Write an enzyme that holds these catalytic residues in place. Sequence first.
Site, PDB file in Angstrom:
ATOM      1  N   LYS A 291      21.080  21.654 -33.828  1.00 34.10           N
ATOM      2  CA  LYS A 291      20.484  23.016 -33.849  1.00 34.10           C
ATOM      3  C   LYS A 291      20.627  23.668 -32.475  1.00 34.10           C
ATOM      4  CE  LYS A 291      17.863  21.693 -37.724  1.00 34.10           C
ATOM      5  NZ  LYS A 291      16.724  20.886 -38.225  1.00 34.10           N
TER       6      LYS A 291
ATOM      7  N   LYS B 165      11.005  21.569 -31.385  1.00 32.37           N
ATOM      8  CA  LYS B 165      11.847  21.136 -32.533  1.00 32.37           C
ATOM      9  C   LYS B 165      12.851  20.067 -32.089  1.00 32.37           C
ATOM     10  CE  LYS B 165      11.979  25.883 -34.354  1.00 32.37           C
ATOM     11  NZ  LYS B 165      12.326  26.616 -35.598  1.00 32.37           N
TER      12      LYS B 165
ATOM     13  N   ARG C 285      26.363  25.141 -46.680  1.00 32.43           N
ATOM     14  CA  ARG C 285      26.451  24.757 -48.106  1.00 32.43           C
ATOM     15  C   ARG C 285      25.961  25.905 -48.997  1.00 32.43           C
ATOM     16  NH1 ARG C 285      21.132  23.908 -49.463  1.00 32.43           N
ATOM     17  NH2 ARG C 285      19.831  23.493 -47.617  1.00 32.43           N
TER      18      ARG C 285
ATOM     19  N   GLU D 185      19.769  31.289 -41.605  1.00 30.43           N
ATOM     20  CA  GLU D 185      18.305  31.481 -41.772  1.00 30.43           C
ATOM     21  C   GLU D 185      17.798  32.260 -40.560  1.00 30.43           C
ATOM     22  OE1 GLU D 185      15.959  28.022 -42.566  1.00 30.43           O
ATOM     23  OE2 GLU D 185      17.398  27.143 -43.967  1.00 30.43           O
TER      24      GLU D 185
ATOM     25  N   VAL E  47      20.078  26.760 -53.377  1.00 38.79           N
ATOM     26  CA  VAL E  47      19.317  26.896 -54.652  1.00 38.79           C
ATOM     27  C   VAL E  47      19.269  28.376 -55.073  1.00 38.79           C
ATOM     28  CG1 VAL E  47      16.998  26.614 -55.642  1.00 38.79           C
ATOM     29  CG2 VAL E  47      17.962  24.795 -54.250  1.00 38.79           C
TER      30      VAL E  47
HETATM   31  N1  LIG Z   1       9.988  29.328 -33.629  1.00 37.42           N
HETATM   32  C1  LIG Z   1       9.535  29.261 -34.882  1.00 37.42           C
HETATM   33  N2  LIG Z   1       8.479  30.012 -35.271  1.00 37.42           N
HETATM   34  C2  LIG Z   1       8.013  29.937 -36.602  1.00 37.42           C
HETATM   35  C3  LIG Z   1       8.657  29.089 -37.493  1.00 37.42           C
HETATM   36  C4  LIG Z   1       8.248  28.969 -38.817  1.00 37.42           C
HETATM   37  C5  LIG Z   1       8.929  28.094 -39.670  1.00 37.42           C
HETATM   38  C6  LIG Z   1       8.523  27.983 -40.996  1.00 37.42           C
HETATM   39  C7  LIG Z   1       9.261  28.670 -41.968  1.00 37.42           C
HETATM   40 CL1  LIG Z   1      10.642  29.650 -41.505  1.00 37.42          CL
HETATM   41  C8  LIG Z   1       8.898  28.575 -43.312  1.00 37.42           C
HETATM   42  C9  LIG Z   1       7.807  27.798 -43.680  1.00 37.42           C
HETATM   43  C10 LIG Z   1       7.072  27.113 -42.713  1.00 37.42           C
HETATM   44  C11 LIG Z   1       7.423  27.191 -41.366  1.00 37.42           C
HETATM   45  C12 LIG Z   1       6.647  26.498 -40.430  1.00 37.42           C
HETATM   46  C13 LIG Z   1       7.032  25.264 -39.915  1.00 37.42           C
HETATM   47  C14 LIG Z   1       6.244  24.588 -38.988  1.00 37.42           C
HETATM   48  C15 LIG Z   1       5.048  25.141 -38.558  1.00 37.42           C
HETATM   49  N3  LIG Z   1       4.649  26.382 -39.061  1.00 37.42           N
HETATM   50  C16 LIG Z   1       5.448  27.055 -39.998  1.00 37.42           C
HETATM   51  C17 LIG Z   1      10.025  27.347 -39.187  1.00 37.42           C
HETATM   52  N4  LIG Z   1      10.760  26.480 -39.926  1.00 37.42           N
HETATM   53  C18 LIG Z   1      12.091  26.058 -39.356  1.00 37.42           C
HETATM   54  C19 LIG Z   1      12.881  25.409 -40.483  1.00 37.42           C
HETATM   55  C20 LIG Z   1      13.052  26.149 -41.813  1.00 37.42           C
HETATM   56  N5  LIG Z   1      14.176  25.728 -42.661  1.00 37.42           N
HETATM   57  C21 LIG Z   1      11.897  25.159 -41.606  1.00 37.42           C
HETATM   58  C22 LIG Z   1      10.542  25.714 -41.243  1.00 37.42           C
HETATM   59  N6  LIG Z   1      10.377  27.505 -37.889  1.00 37.42           N
HETATM   60  C23 LIG Z   1       9.740  28.337 -37.041  1.00 37.42           C
HETATM   61  N7  LIG Z   1      10.148  28.437 -35.758  1.00 37.42           N
END
Ligand SMILES: Nc1ncc2cc(-c3c(Cl)cccc3-c3cccnc3)c(N3C[C@@H]4[C@@H](N)[C@@H]4C3)nc2n1
Length: 440
Positions: free
Chosen positions: A116, A159, A287, A271, A290
């Site tokens: 990533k 992350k 890929r 995304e 869904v």
């Molecule tokens: N910097 C930042 N800020 C907010 C984020 C929110 C998500 C997220 C999403 Cl996009 C959807 C559903 C849940 C989350 C998420 C993940 C962890 C903590 N809080 C929300 C998220 N995700 C990154 C990755 C998506 N395919 C899965 C969830 N990343 C985030 N990154």
Amino acid sequence: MLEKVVIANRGEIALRILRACKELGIKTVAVHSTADRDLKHVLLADETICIGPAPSAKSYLNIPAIIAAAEVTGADAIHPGYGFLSENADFAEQVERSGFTFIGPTADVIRLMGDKVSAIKAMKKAGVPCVPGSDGPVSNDIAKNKEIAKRIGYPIIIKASGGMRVVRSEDALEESIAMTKAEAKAAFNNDMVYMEKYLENPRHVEIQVLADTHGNAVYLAERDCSMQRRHQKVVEEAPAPGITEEVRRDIGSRCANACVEIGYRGAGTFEFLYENGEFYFIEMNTRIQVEHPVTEMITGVDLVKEQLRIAAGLPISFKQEDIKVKGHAMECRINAEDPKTFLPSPGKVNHLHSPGGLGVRWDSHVYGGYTVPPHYDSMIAKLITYGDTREVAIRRMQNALSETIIDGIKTNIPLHELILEDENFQKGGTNIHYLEKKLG
Ligand SMILES: Nc1ncc2cc(-c3c(Cl)cccc3-c3cccnc3)c(N3C[C@@H]4[C@@H](N)[C@@H]4C3)nc2n1
């Protein structure tokens, strides 16, 4: 070109692929587990091959058995669908090296966007806006970490580049990094982690792209996947409400530029996080997804047909300027699960009644008398509606769901019905936490 494709998947996506193949006159090999002998796509296939017992580990993740199945049938190519081996570069490598076409990107482009931080490198490089972050891997020098963290400001999120942690205050940073690192080495083999500015109420917005071996690349608007529950998407729509042709064109174009920069190949998704009018890239799926059908409904593109064409060395069958977004599309993921506890509900479907009429599409391998098995995911059908407006797609989905009869197992249909009459959902622009709060 392609005369024979191995369908290295199952369920609705294996049937979606079979349908595409048949339409193009491409011969289908269905590789299946013991427990998937009775799948719709398997019974409709030209050739069938049991690649091992029910567990996905000794069947749909059996890299040797699938390649072996390609060798024996004299297959030209392998379609990995979604999940399983679709994002696995080692699999893609073993496929290309064994003399077959992997339907999807080249191994070195999968590895690149699988990592990533290196993916985020590429998108910055292509002019594509990213989350304020570390702009690279973070070091154990925690003085230097606090500095970057206080630059973007709290809350921040840590992350893994190849299991993430929200940090709300400087007091809990040093430890919170060393934790996330140590989890990765023991888990994902790779101790590399990065920081982003944690967005508290973002919407999840995805751009669909196609890139070919002729150097063409196109963007097919976006999907809003915000209506999710603990990392599982429940409803998807296209286009994403609030997003204009003007903004679609811009970030859409920048994703198309990036596809060429990195020599991307086939169908793919960028995304994004979407908060306060601004886009922030987070990761890319290399890929078919869904929720591809909602994009098909608003562009009249056949995304799986183009995957097959691209894989055969053909150009994309159309040009960016031939695409116009018309109307609006909703997909409800219909799962064999308890609509409140989300506990799987496998067993015999006694009676199935599919909905139909104008603007109603039903993508499902399920039929009356089909037994939903325990060994895989709970998805049984994708109910997709089109309307001229967001209102009609919603109303059409409502009528379609109250027509849908599925006896013998529980489904999440009552969940969909709740969502579709929710006043905030009808208004549109609900963020990614909405469904969790509403289920409180
Ligand atoms: N910097 C930042 N800020 C907010 C984020 C929110 C998500 C997220 C999403 Cl996009 C959807 C559903 C849940 C989350 C998420 C993940 C962890 C903590 N809080 C929300 C998220 N995700 C990154 C990755 C998506 N395919 C899965 C969830 N990343 C985030 N990154």
